[PDB]
Amino acid sequence: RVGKYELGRTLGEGTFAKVKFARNVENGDNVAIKVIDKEKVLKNKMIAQIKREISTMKLIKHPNVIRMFEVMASKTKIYFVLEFVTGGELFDKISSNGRLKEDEARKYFQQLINAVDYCHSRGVYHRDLKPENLLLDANGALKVSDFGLSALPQQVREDGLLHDTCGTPNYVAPEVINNKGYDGAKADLWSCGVILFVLMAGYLPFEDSNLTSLYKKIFKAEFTCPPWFSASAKKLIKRILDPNPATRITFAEVIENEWFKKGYKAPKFENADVDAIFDDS
Amino acid sequence: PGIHSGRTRVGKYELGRTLGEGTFAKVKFARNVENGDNVAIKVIDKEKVLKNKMIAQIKREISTMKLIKHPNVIRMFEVMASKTKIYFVLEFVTGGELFDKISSNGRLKEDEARKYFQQLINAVDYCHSRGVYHRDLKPENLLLDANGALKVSDFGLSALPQQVREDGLLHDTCGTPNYVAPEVINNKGYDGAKADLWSCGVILFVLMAGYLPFEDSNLTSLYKKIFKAEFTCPPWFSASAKKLIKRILDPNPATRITFAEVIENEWFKKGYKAPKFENDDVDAIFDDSGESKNLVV
Numbered sequence A: 001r002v003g004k005y006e007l008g009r010t011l012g013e014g015t016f017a018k019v020k021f022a023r024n025v026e027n028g029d030n031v032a033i034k035v036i037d038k039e040k041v042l043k044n045k046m047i048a049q050i051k052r053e054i055s056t057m058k059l060i061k062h063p064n065v066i067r068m069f070e071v072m073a074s075k076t077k078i079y080f081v082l083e084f085v086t087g088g089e090l091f092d093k094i095s096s097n098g099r100l101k102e103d104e105a106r107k108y109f110q111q112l113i114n115a116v117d118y119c120h121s122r123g124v125y126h127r128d129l130k131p132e133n134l135l136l137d138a139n140g141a142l143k144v145s146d147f148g149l150s151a152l153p154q155q156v157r158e159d160g161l162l163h164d165t166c167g168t169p170n171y172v173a174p175e176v177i178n179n180k181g182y183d184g185a186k187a188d189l190w191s192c193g194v195i196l197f198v199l200m201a202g203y204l205p206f207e208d209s210n211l212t213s214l215y216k217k218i219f220k221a222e223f224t225c226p227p228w229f230s231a232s233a234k235k236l237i238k239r240i241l242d243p244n245p246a247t248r249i250t251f252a253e254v255i256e257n258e259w260f261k262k263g264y265k266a267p268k269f270e271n272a273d274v275d276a277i278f279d280d281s
Numbered sequence B: 001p002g003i004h005s006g007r008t009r010v011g012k013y014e015l016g017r018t019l020g021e022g023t024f025a026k027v028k029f030a031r032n033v034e035n036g037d038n039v040a041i042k043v044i045d046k047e048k049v050l051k052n053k054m055i056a057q058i059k060r061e062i063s064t065m066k067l068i069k070h071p072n073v074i075r076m077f078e079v080m081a082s083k084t085k086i087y088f089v090l091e092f093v094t095g096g097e098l099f100d101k102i103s104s105n106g107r108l109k110e111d112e113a114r115k116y117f118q119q120l121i122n123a124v125d126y127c128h129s130r131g132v133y134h135r136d137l138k139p140e141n142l143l144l145d146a147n148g149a150l151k152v153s154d155f156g157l158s159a160l161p162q163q164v165r166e167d168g169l170l171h172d173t174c175g176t177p178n179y180v181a182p183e184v185i186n187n188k189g190y191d192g193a194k195a196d197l198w199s200c201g202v203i204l205f206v207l208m209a210g211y212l213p214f215e216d217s218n219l220t221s222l223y224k225k226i227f228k229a230e231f232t233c234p235p236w237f238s239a240s241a242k243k244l245i246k247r248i249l250d251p252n253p254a255t256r257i258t259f260a261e262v263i264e265n266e267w268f269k270k271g272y273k274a275p276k277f278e279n280d281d282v283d284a285i286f287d288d289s290g291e292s293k294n295l296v297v
């Protein structure tokens, strides 16, 4: 046993991190418990940011963000307890049934933008948003995974789980491909825009069998919207997928956008020590 | 079974609704009106297909796959064509994707992983012996029948450019680097057999480990790991399995183990039982078939 949590099967076991299924004995909620090497994260250059973002994600409750229930530590380990959802991955709808209708795409896009924008407002940037982070609960609501956790060092992100993405480079903004540092908000917004493209088209905007030509297209944002895209959706997508992060549209501008505001009901919800986030207890 | 006057018709197949749509290709359900068989039909713009410098290789590989019947290869039953479309008539399977097991239960036991690997290696080597190279092996091509037997998809079709093939179902233009051999990433993957073998080794790794041998959120680090074949086998891998995987994941295709040598590897041969199974006009593969249509619709 571990905490108020009863353990189930091992989901993955990487070298410095591992993930177990569990349930909360007090309420029966499904969770996953990630156990990671403590010194690997303590030694890391960006530890103060890690501590800050993780401490923040503990506090955040947004209806469209995966909950981080607990964060505890041993002398050698850090434990994370994360909400486990049962509706699968959002992109499964495309694998099984092709592109989504515009209204269903816009709905998920609204949940996504609001959740991402909310985390940004609390100083937390994903920086590696991929379709595999777009999960669905029993009722079909979007739950975005890995905010905060994505800030951990690579060797601890290798946690024994299968992580592949169809069309990986598509979701990474040109400035993230090419540069060491970058703006987190603009990098996340690029990812969201590609996600929206795929939901509405059923296929990736950037492709080429030739890798040099593929990355050339990404850096110029050379892509083509299919004919079923509306004029207003195409125009918003082209502003989001601006290959220059200096001129790329802002989240605030996306939220004010006429296409975006269609059927848009901002969700009503409420959300009302850092250095000691990983010490023993 | 009944021909349905209000449905589209090609050969003995009646076409149903569109499942997926790409720019040049669509996928529809269809059914054989003679015997009730349900199939999937990929319909692709004919001019787009023909106007390619690789059309000869495409006709050859599609012609071969149409004739192949392997227990671990998805069947291509028929190819028909109109003036403007090519119809590839393909087998459905019900068991989903192989990696679904992993994605839910993590790694498989050594014996079960070795079983799927034997199935994969046999099918791929079989197609190689007939001159067909896949070159695009990835999780999306590893399907399962109701018996839970592996069925490899896209042999033959993978010869088409991914952009022409793209059907709006998230598999054709994936181009995921994690499954791709370093020489192929480097635009020098001449030996198609060694390139497919690398992918198969990455697949074996995932089944036994539950995760990818090369992964990184940083694209530069990812490609670097691939070119150097920098990876670590988990501690539960046996000495023999580790020995084989390291021979497969050799980033020099020249020194990389061959398909034939894998088949004779002592670990691969464990419980191994090769399949017991059977067994122009190539140029005309895509000619207008003159198949009856339904003129109502």
Ligand SMILES: C[C@H](CCC(=O)NCCC[N+](C)(C)CCCS(=O)(=O)[O-])[C@H]1CC[C@H]2[C@@H]3[C@H](O)C[C@@H]4C[C@H](O)CC[C@]4(C)[C@H]3C[C@H](O)[C@@]12C
Binding pocket: A177, A178, A179, A180, A211, A212, A215, B185, B186, B187, B218, B219, B220, B223
């Ligand atoms: C030029 C860009 C970006 C490289 C980069 O920037 N990598 C380091 C960034 C991250 N760091 C934090 C480590 C920065 C280091 C600190 S510093 O600030 O000092 O940079 C990189 C990103 C991925 C690279 C691919 C591989 O080459 C080879 C590959 C196959 C063929 O062969 C050619 C094509 C292809 C697809 C290439 C495309 C791309 O065009 C390259 C060159």
Ligand SMILES: C[C@H](CCC(=O)NCCC[N+](C)(C)CCCS(=O)(=O)[O-])[C@H]1CC[C@H]2[C@@H]3[C@H](O)C[C@@H]4C[C@H](O)CC[C@]4(C)[C@H]3C[C@H](O)[C@]12C
Binding pocket: A019, A031, A032, A066, A082, A083, A084, A085, A086, A088, A089, A132, A135, A145, A146, A147, A149, A161, B103, B104
């Ligand atoms: C990959 C799967 C979704 C796909 C899926 O399918 N999940 C299992 C169910 C399989 N089924 C039994 C339903 C299929 C058979 C039924 S059938 O009727 O089809 O036969 C999803 C669902 C829950 C997700 C985890 C949790 O969020 C907690 C945690 C959050 C972190 O941030 C990232 C890590 C971690 C461990 C997440 C990883 C991953 O993202 C999980 C496993």
Ligand SMILES: C[C@H](CCC(=O)NCCC[N+](C)(C)CCCS(=O)(=O)[O-])[C@H]1CC[C@H]2[C@@H]3[C@H](O)C[C@@H]4C[C@H](O)CC[C@]4(C)[C@H]3C[C@H](O)[C@]12C
Binding pocket: A095, A096, A097, B019, B027, B040, B042, B074, B090, B091, B092, B093, B094, B095, B096, B097, B140, B143, B153, B154, B155, B157, B169, B171
């Ligand atoms: C993504 C799914 C597997 C996962 C899944 O979703 N499994 C649910 C099974 C449900 N059914 C049994 C009713 C059949 C599917 C109905 S569905 O709702 O999925 O349309 C797999 C299993 C069968 C696969 C197709 C066939 O190989 C024929 C053809 C081969 C070409 O090379 C590539 C194109 C095509 C159309 C393939 C596309 C895709 O790769 C399919 C749908």
